[PDB]
Design a protein around this ligand. Structure first.
Ligand SMILES: [Mg+2]
Ligand SMILES: [Mg+2]
Ligand SMILES: [Mg+2]
Ligand SMILES: [Mg+2]
Ligand SMILES: [Mg+2]
Ligand SMILES: [Mg+2]
Ligand SMILES: [Mg+2]
Ligand SMILES: [Mg+2]
Ligand SMILES: [Mg+2]
Ligand SMILES: [Mg+2]
Ligand SMILES: [Mg+2]
Ligand SMILES: [Mg+2]
Ligand SMILES: [Mg+2]
Ligand SMILES: [Mg+2]
Ligand SMILES: [Mg+2]
Ligand SMILES: [Mg+2]
Ligand SMILES: [Mg+2]
Ligand SMILES: [Mg+2]
Ligand SMILES: [Mg+2]
Ligand SMILES: [Mg+2]
Ligand SMILES: [Mg+2]
Ligand SMILES: [Mg+2]
Ligand SMILES: [Mg+2]
Ligand SMILES: [Mg+2]
Ligand SMILES: [Mg+2]
Ligand SMILES: [Mg+2]
Ligand SMILES: [Mg+2]
Ligand SMILES: [Mg+2]
Ligand SMILES: [Mg+2]
Ligand SMILES: [Mg+2]
Ligand SMILES: [Mg+2]
Ligand SMILES: [Mg+2]
Ligand SMILES: [Mg+2]
Ligand SMILES: [Mg+2]
Ligand SMILES: [Mg+2]
Ligand SMILES: [Mg+2]
Ligand SMILES: [Mg+2]
Ligand SMILES: [Mg+2]
Ligand SMILES: [Mg+2]
Ligand SMILES: [Mg+2]
Ligand SMILES: [Mg+2]
Ligand SMILES: [Mg+2]
Ligand SMILES: [Mg+2]
Ligand SMILES: [Mg+2]
Ligand SMILES: [Mg+2]
Ligand SMILES: [Mg+2]
Ligand SMILES: [Mg+2]
Ligand SMILES: [Mg+2]
Ligand SMILES: [Mg+2]
Ligand SMILES: [Mg+2]
Ligand SMILES: [Mg+2]
Ligand SMILES: [Mg+2]
Ligand SMILES: [Mg+2]
Ligand SMILES: [Mg+2]
Ligand SMILES: [Mg+2]
Ligand SMILES: [Mg+2]
Ligand SMILES: [Mg+2]
Ligand SMILES: [Mg+2]
Ligand SMILES: [Mg+2]
Ligand SMILES: [Mg+2]
Ligand SMILES: [Mg+2]
Ligand SMILES: [Mg+2]
Ligand SMILES: [Mg+2]
Ligand SMILES: [Mg+2]
Ligand SMILES: [Mg+2]
Ligand SMILES: [Mg+2]
Ligand SMILES: [Mg+2]
Ligand SMILES: [Mg+2]
Ligand SMILES: [Mg+2]
Ligand SMILES: [Mg+2]
Ligand SMILES: [Mg+2]
Ligand SMILES: [Mg+2]
Ligand SMILES: [Mg+2]
Ligand SMILES: [Mg+2]
Ligand SMILES: [Mg+2]
Ligand SMILES: [Mg+2]
Ligand SMILES: [Mg+2]
Ligand SMILES: [Mg+2]
Ligand SMILES: [Mg+2]
Ligand SMILES: [Mg+2]
Ligand SMILES: [Mg+2]
Ligand SMILES: [Mg+2]
Ligand SMILES: [Mg+2]
Ligand SMILES: [Mg+2]
Ligand SMILES: [Mg+2]
Ligand SMILES: [Mg+2]
Ligand SMILES: [Mg+2]
Ligand SMILES: [Mg+2]
Ligand SMILES: [Mg+2]
Ligand SMILES: [Mg+2]
Ligand SMILES: [Mg+2]
Ligand SMILES: [Zn+2]
Lengths: 99, 99, 208, 83
RNA sequence: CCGAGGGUAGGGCCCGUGACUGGGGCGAAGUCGUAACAAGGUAGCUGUACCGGAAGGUGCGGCUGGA
RNA sequence: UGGAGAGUUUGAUCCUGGCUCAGGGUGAACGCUGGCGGCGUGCCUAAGACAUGCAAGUCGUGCGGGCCGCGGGGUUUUACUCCGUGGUCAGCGGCGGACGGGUGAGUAACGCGUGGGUGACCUACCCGGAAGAGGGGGACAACCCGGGGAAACUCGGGCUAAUCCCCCAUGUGGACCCGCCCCUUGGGGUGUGUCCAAAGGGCUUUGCCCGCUUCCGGAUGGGCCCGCGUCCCAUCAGCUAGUUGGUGGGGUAAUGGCCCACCAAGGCGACGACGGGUAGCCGGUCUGAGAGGAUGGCCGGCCACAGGGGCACUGAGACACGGGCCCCACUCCUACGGGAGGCAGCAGUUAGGAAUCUUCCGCAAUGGGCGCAAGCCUGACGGAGCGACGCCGCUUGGAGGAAGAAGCCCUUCGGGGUGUAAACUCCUGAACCCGGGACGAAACCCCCGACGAGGGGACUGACGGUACCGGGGUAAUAGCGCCGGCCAACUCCGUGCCAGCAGCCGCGGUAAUACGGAGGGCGCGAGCGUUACCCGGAUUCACUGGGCGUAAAGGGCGUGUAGGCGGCCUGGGGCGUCCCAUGUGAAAGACCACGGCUCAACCGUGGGGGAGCGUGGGAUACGCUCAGGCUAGACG
């Protein structure tokens, strides 16, 4: 079975490519707390109807390009902009951790 | 001091000289076929394609090429000859291209 | 290995006549009945207050030097006994009394465990047909510790079993003086055993 | 080829071969594919050779060349018989 | 065309070393004061500034782990 | 079936708190001592350099020859030796050199682990089945002739054969463009077109065997990809410009920026990017009560490397340990034009080191290659040797034996101690002596059978005349540490803050149970000690399992971004969670039974966990989120 991963897209601003943000959660191997370590996967969707804010599913596909090793499968939500703003502020947290 | 893998060294130089001759003939018949079909020619530019196709499938019959590399050679030669004869070709007397 | 030699010195030093010499330790010249105080230039002085380590070490020595086991052989027996499922001391004592030299001593082919050690090491004793030259040879429950043909007519085994004509071997053992053999029936316990050893202190010695 | 062969185990002068299926490439005690049987070449137990005859027949069905002695230890287990 | 390697020029990081010097530890019952702990013989400590062989002093303020 | 504490801050106590110690362990080393045997195990550093031998070959049943040894005339001498071949010596050709073996340098990564994907693939040899193998040629070594070169070798001319290469046809089939449905990211079915095969050899002959071609499926071996785990440093905070994406190509077996053109500004980053240090990873191993910490030796899997670096060729697979080419470093030959090398194979030498061995025997076994088979090769391996390096086993005697010798050490002068310890009495007899002496090995082969299954046959042991067994036979190595407490075991003498001890506390200044010696004792014993390293103690990084007033520790305080956490009733989902059968969790180890070596170490079998992770179903309290509501929180 191919890997099937839910996630919310956070970037679509390439050609034929969306960037989906899978947020897996798993117990700590030592302390056992449930933690949400996210991860950003590039995806492929040449019809390009998944704008910045949609929530898609992702199938493990043959490599479309280097790092672009996934495909969009299906939409399960419209614009979840309140979830994409979490990451879109989490990126903007990084100008202040400079020197 | 020596070993008689030197027989294999002098076999490999021979086989290099003996399959380079049926490897570079592929590339130059490819260039002739692509160029003559690019300049609006005809059956005169498909006889070159059947020539290169016979050369490829005679190359794959030994150790010069895989079957799969032979198929890729032909699938990126004669595909290009067909989309190059798209440009006002009309192969009435057409050889390797299947109508 | 055998530690050597002087053994009524260890009949002393722990205050209990753990019999090692044999008929000497039964006869009135044990030098433990004669002098119960430990060997040494001080010896018969005030008892130094036995520490918590000291009492466990003395009684672990009471368990060891009865059987004459070298310490790492003893400790490997213990770390087999702890893995072996059972009441740990009361399987450890049965494992100690299931050595071939100790089964030959309890069977009375020899007046002492060190004489029984010479008997089994010099190829006299047979276990289940053929001779076994090992004092550390365990005896499974239900096998016949016998005397072979080259040692059946021995004067030592003859005098030993002469002494054992009518003696009482254990309920986990048997005896046969007409064929000079004995079935090791089962393993013994401390309720079966005449040990001057609280086994529990030996168990507590090894979680140091 | 996927050979059935006798991968050695056991101490010095304590040979205990293990009739097993490996590739023809791997070393003697390599990662095998299936232990089809064991063979003490000393018969120190009464049950010194045991072979799973069904999986031996399967590995012969998908192509195997059991070697000069694995042929012997399958014949003495009754694998090449037709019944 | 790419190309290991060599060169040139300039970067970054790390290390050895460098006259001398700033401190630091640590010696032998050194010299020099007596700062602290007793209301340490000016209550102490700390911020900071200035000064002073030196502990330190004083100013402004705080604190009480001072009355 | 699982958990020990102690010494030390002070006059004394309690606390916090650190240091130290008893324990186990090792690729060990070092000191003293050292008898045997088995099993393992042995250059951790210079992945520094290598003498010497071997470590990779093999096939006349693929082919043509040179070469010598049995039989000799097509002619009135072998003598175009053609033959029947009988081997060696190369050569062509095929297969194997890509496995086996070695090492830890590199690599912080899809490398590894682990679970999947390969509608994006290969897979020689092997196996199932299909369909066959008809005609032609050709040069290329050997060889001969000639030349060059010191040598390495190299070149020119002429041959010549084959399972060498090429051409033509047959095309079951397969490939490719689209003849189009269908599976639905890039297929067997398809259809015209186009392209493509092939090889013979031995033999009892109007026979099989060994080969061969193409294709489909298998099995194994992989390639590549992805989720997840993968050290330390934030006093490394920004990094990246083929970087990120597209399109069109090129290459690859295949996806991919794997590489190239054009366009687009992207990709990554406090969930630690980038940079630096270190490091092979894992099964495991050690430790631990367990969680966890450490580690990756031997054995097994995988990657990487083969003097450093790059590169392709050949081939199924290599970007190749013992193939090539180049640069660089080094060595060696040179007649100075160039050559040759590659021990991180086994053994070995040197060098560094505290330290790590034999230039051993053998393919008898198992494995690997070639061969139809005999056979050949195999420093893989099977064994042996060396080294207490570890584990395990064994011996150095046993039974007597004195109110207790001598010697020695104390002594209160009475004696006590060494101590049944000794001598001696028996008697058992390791080593040693003699004879027998393997299991390790019945396969290959030969025959019946059928040129299968089954029956019968023989030959074949390095270890090794070893183990073991049968007989005889000598009483026949014990040392090392420690004795103030922790820590078991104490007196005397010599020493006099000296000499020295030490792990911490500390002893040592003239009565030292702490130093040096003797006696005695304790511990362990062919070992005992020391060192280094690791874990435990260390609940001293605290998840189980710590704290923060004064002991080390509250941020100066607020607002607040990320985050983390979240009131009550309701309902679905089933994401966390939990459950159930599986799939994997390799073997080896660990664990448990039960067996074989005289036991044990080891080793064999069986069984069970086995965290995880995928898959399918179920559970719905709790965590989740979407929907609905409430008012106890919060705000107005
Ligand atoms: Mg692309
Ligand atoms: Mg005696
Ligand atoms: Mg314990
Ligand atoms: Mg001075
Ligand atoms: Mg003075
Ligand atoms: Mg003052
Ligand atoms: Mg003062
Ligand atoms: Mg004052
Ligand atoms: Mg004042
Ligand atoms: Mg004051
Ligand atoms: Mg000044
Ligand atoms: Mg001051
Ligand atoms: Mg002033
Ligand atoms: Mg001030
Ligand atoms: Mg105290
Ligand atoms: Mg103090
Ligand atoms: Mg105290
Ligand atoms: Mg504390
Ligand atoms: Mg412990
Ligand atoms: Mg040593
Ligand atoms: Mg070596
Ligand atoms: Mg070296
Ligand atoms: Mg080297
Ligand atoms: Mg040789
Ligand atoms: Mg050849
Ligand atoms: Mg043949
Ligand atoms: Mg090795
Ligand atoms: Mg590395
Ligand atoms: Mg990094
Ligand atoms: Mg890095
Ligand atoms: Mg990774
Ligand atoms: Mg995998
Ligand atoms: Mg081939
Ligand atoms: Mg010539
Ligand atoms: Mg044809
Ligand atoms: Mg032909
Ligand atoms: Mg696979
Ligand atoms: Mg290829
Ligand atoms: Mg492609
Ligand atoms: Mg790239
Ligand atoms: Mg680096
Ligand atoms: Mg690791
Ligand atoms: Mg612990
Ligand atoms: Mg680990
Ligand atoms: Mg290995
Ligand atoms: Mg390299
Ligand atoms: Mg090199
Ligand atoms: Mg290289
Ligand atoms: Mg190739
Ligand atoms: Mg090679
Ligand atoms: Mg290799
Ligand atoms: Mg190469
Ligand atoms: Mg010259
Ligand atoms: Mg010159
Ligand atoms: Mg030359
Ligand atoms: Mg080499
Ligand atoms: Mg073989
Ligand atoms: Mg060997
Ligand atoms: Mg040894
Ligand atoms: Mg004696
Ligand atoms: Mg005397
Ligand atoms: Mg005798
Ligand atoms: Mg005698
Ligand atoms: Mg035989
Ligand atoms: Mg053979
Ligand atoms: Mg037969
Ligand atoms: Mg033969
Ligand atoms: Mg004898
Ligand atoms: Mg004591
Ligand atoms: Mg002096
Ligand atoms: Mg000392
Ligand atoms: Mg004096
Ligand atoms: Mg004195
Ligand atoms: Mg002393
Ligand atoms: Mg520690
Ligand atoms: Mg801990
Ligand atoms: Mg906690
Ligand atoms: Mg404080
Ligand atoms: Mg404080
Ligand atoms: Mg504070
Ligand atoms: Mg601050
Ligand atoms: Mg505050
Ligand atoms: Mg707030
Ligand atoms: Mg929030
Ligand atoms: Mg759930
Ligand atoms: Mg299962
Ligand atoms: Mg297992
Ligand atoms: Mg037995
Ligand atoms: Mg075993
Ligand atoms: Mg087993
Ligand atoms: Mg779990
Ligand atoms: Zn006694």
């Amino acid at each position: 079975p191919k890997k099937v991963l839910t996630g919310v897209v956070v970037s679509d601003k390439m050609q034929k490519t969306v960037t989906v943000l899978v947020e897996r959660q798993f117990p700590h191997p030592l302390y056992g707390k449930v933690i949400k370590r996210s991860k950003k996967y590039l995806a492929h969707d040449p019809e390009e109807k998944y704008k910045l804010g949609d929530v898609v599913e992702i199938i493990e596909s043959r490599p479309i390009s280097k790092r672009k090793r996934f495909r969009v499968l299906r939409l399960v939500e419209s614009g979840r902009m309140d979830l994409v703003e979490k990451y879109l502020i989490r990126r903007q947290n990084y100008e202040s951790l400079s020197k | 001091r020596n070993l008689s893998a030197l027989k294999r060294h002098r076999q490999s130089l021979k086989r290099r000289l003996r399959n380079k001759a049926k490897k570079s003939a592929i590339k130059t018949l490819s260039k002739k076929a692509i160029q003559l079909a690019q300049e609006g020619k005809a059956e005169e530019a498909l006889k070159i394609m059947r020539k290169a196709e016979s050369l490829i499938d005679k190359a794959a019959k030994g150790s010069t090429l895989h079957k799969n590399a032979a198929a890729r050679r032909k699938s990126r030669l004669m595909r290009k000859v067909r989309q190059l004869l798209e440009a006002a070709g009309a192969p009435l007397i057409g050889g390797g291209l299947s109508a | 290995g055998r530690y050597i030699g002087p053994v009524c010195r260890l009949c002393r030093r722990e205050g209990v006549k753990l019999y090692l010499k044999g008929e000497r330790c039964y006869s009135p010249k044990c030098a433990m009945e004669r002098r119960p105080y430990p060997p040494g230039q001080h010896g018969q002085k005030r008892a130094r207050r036995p520490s918590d380590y000291a009492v466990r070490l003395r009684e672990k020595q009471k368990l060891r030097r009865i059987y004459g086991i070298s310490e790492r052989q003893f400790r490997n027996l213990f770390e087999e006994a702890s893995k072996k499922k059972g009441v740990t001391g009361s399987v450890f004592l049965g494992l100690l009394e299931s050595r071939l030299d100790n089964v030959v001593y309890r069977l009375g082919f020899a007046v002492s465990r060190r004489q029984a050690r010479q008997l089994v090491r010099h190829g006299h004793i047979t276990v289940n047909g053929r001779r076994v030259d090992l004092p550390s040879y365990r005896v499974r429950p239900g096998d016949e510790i016998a005397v072979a043909e080259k040692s059946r007519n021995l004067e030592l085994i003859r005098q030993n079993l002469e002494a054992m004509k009518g003696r009482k071997v254990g309920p986990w053992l048997s005896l046969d003086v007409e064929g000079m053999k004995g079935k090791f029936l089962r393993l013994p316990d401390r309720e079966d055993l005449a040990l001057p050893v609280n086994e529990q202190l030996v168990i507590e010695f090894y979680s140091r | 080829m996927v050979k059935i062969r006798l991968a050695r185990f056991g101490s010095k002068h304590n040979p205990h071969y293990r009739i097993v299926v490996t590739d023809a490439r791997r070393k003697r005690d390599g990662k095998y594919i299936e232990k089809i049987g064991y063979y003490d070449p000393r018969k120190t137990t009464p049950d010194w050779l045991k072979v799973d005859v069904e999986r031996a027949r399967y590995w012969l069905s998908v192509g195997a060349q059991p070697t000069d002695t694995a042929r012997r230890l399958l014949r003495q287990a009754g694998v090449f018989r037709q019944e």
